Design a protein around this ligand. Structure first.
Ligand SMILES: [Cl-]
Ligand code: NA
Ligand code: NA
Length: 97
């Protein structure tokens, strides 16, 4: 058993409220996922619990893939990643519903 993929998308435009995070996302955009992993949407009764799992699974997979190549995420990266992935997971739940 694995997870469903989504198709790759352009990393979303996000106006982060924290200005330094806002700039950091742009500077370091390629560090973050452009596609999401998830359990099938018909297994969820609402957007919120889907997105919750989609973010957890996707961040787990990306962090694992990154760590094993000898690379690292900063605490900033993690905060930005969670937001990025949340937006893509919402998109995915809307597109795939
Ligand atoms: Cl992109
Ligand atoms: Na601000
Ligand atoms: Na990094």
């Amino acid at each position: 058993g694995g997870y469903m993929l989504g198709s790759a998308m352009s990393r979303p435009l996000i106006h982060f409220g924290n200005d330094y995070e806002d700039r950091y996302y742009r500077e370091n955009m390629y560090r973050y996922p452009n596609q999401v992993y998830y359990r099938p949407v018909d297994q969820y009764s609402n957007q919120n619990s889907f997105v919750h799992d989609c973010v957890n699974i996707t961040v787990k997979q990306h962090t694992v893939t990154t760590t094993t190549k000898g690379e690292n995420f900063t605490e900033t990266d993690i905060k930005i990643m969670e937001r990025v992935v949340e937006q893509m997971c919402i998109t995915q739940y809307q597109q795939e519903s």
